[PDB]
Design a protein around this ligand. Structure first.
Ligand SMILES: Nc1ncnc2c1ncn2[C@@H]1O[C@H](CSCC[C@H](N)C(=O)O)[C@@H](O)[C@H]1O
Ligand SMILES: O=S(=O)(NCCC(F)(F)F)c1ccc2c(c1)CN[C@@H](CF)C2
Length: 261
């Protein structure tokens, strides 16, 4: 409830500005964190080993880039978040309403990276078409989505970016939160986890969030303890010019894990 309390001042547009607009949001530099995250996602799905019918995005927040390469492998996509404000923001983009955040640059780069000759409008069209619902969620609950969630369970795959560490006060919480979401994933399923490395706080407007600083090994061990087979775990070290005053993140990790059940 302590963290949950802090997230009450969370400003969606301040978050988007701090992390998805320049300099961090500049996709032109191939050395940026942006191109790196999109490549990890694209390369993974390009292996063709992450497929199914349903997929759930945990703690989607007000962003969609994490689903750009995934949307063409899953016909039923469910997005989620603890904050009403974030679900509202996602709606504005999915419905193409006024003031929606502009993700066209990311769509274009996903198309560029994937290399299938696809135009970005068709990519955004496909994603919007496959996202069937935006549901509330709380990874701190043994049943994240709840009792009678409209989401098809178990899911064939899960995607989660910058959520778990951002909502857990310490390692143990991180672990449980991971066990909580893992129940949502069908045995043999896949989990694509992205997150901040060794970060302790980040700003989102008037909100100042505490973060549990984790390391690559701690993430690996946590995934194993939860019953996953780590297929891939990479690290991106945050360059100096991407070190702004919005947080103290040291790097970013990408984990492709398979629930071995
Ligand atoms: N208990 C909880 N369970 C699930 N999500 C939570 C949560 N508490 C906070 N969150 C959400 O977790 C998000 C962390 S920011 C990450 C946003 C997005 N996934 C990205 O890649 O940028 C926020 O949207 C916040 O509202
Ligand atoms: O800089 S990033 O690695 N990616 C943004 C740049 C982009 F969009 F181009 F990929 C990033 C994204 C989100 C967050 C961070 C970094 C670090 N703070 C967390 C707190 F939860 C949120």
């Amino acid at each position: 409830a302590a963290v949950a309390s802090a997230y009450q001042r969370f400003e969606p547009r301040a978050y988007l500005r701090n992390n998805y607009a320049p300099p961090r949001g500049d996709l032109c530099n191939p050395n940026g964190v942006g191109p790196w995250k999109l490549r990890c996602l694209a390369q993974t799905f390009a292996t063709g080993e992450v497929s199914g019918r349903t997929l759930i995005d945990i703690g989607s927040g007000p962003t969609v880039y994490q689903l750009l390469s995934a949307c063409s492998h899953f016909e039923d996509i469910t997005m989620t978040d603890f904050l009403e404000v974030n679900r509202q923001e996602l709606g504005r983009w999915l419905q193409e309403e006024p003031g929606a955040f502009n993700w066209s640059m990311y769509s274009q780069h996903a198309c560029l990276i994937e290399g299938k000759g696809e135009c970005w409008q068709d990519k955004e069209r496909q994603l919007r078409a496959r996202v069937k619902r935006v549901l509330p969620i709380d990874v701190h609950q043994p049943q994240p989505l709840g009792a009678g969630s409209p989401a098809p369970l178990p899911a064939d795959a899960l995607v989660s970016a910058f959520c778990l560490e951002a909502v857990s006060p310490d390692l143990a919480s991180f672990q449980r939160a991971l066990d909580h979401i893992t129940t949502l994933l069908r045995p043999g399923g896949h989990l694509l986890l992205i997150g901040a490395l060794e970060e302790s706080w980040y700003l989102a407007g008037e909100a100042r969030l505490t973060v549990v600083p984790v390391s690559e090994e701690e993430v690996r061990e946590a995934l194993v303890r939860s019953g996953y087979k780590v297929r891939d775990l990479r690290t991106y070290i945050m360059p100096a010019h991407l070190q702004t005053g919005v947080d103290d993140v040291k790097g970013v990790f990408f984990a492709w894990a398979q629930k071995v059940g």
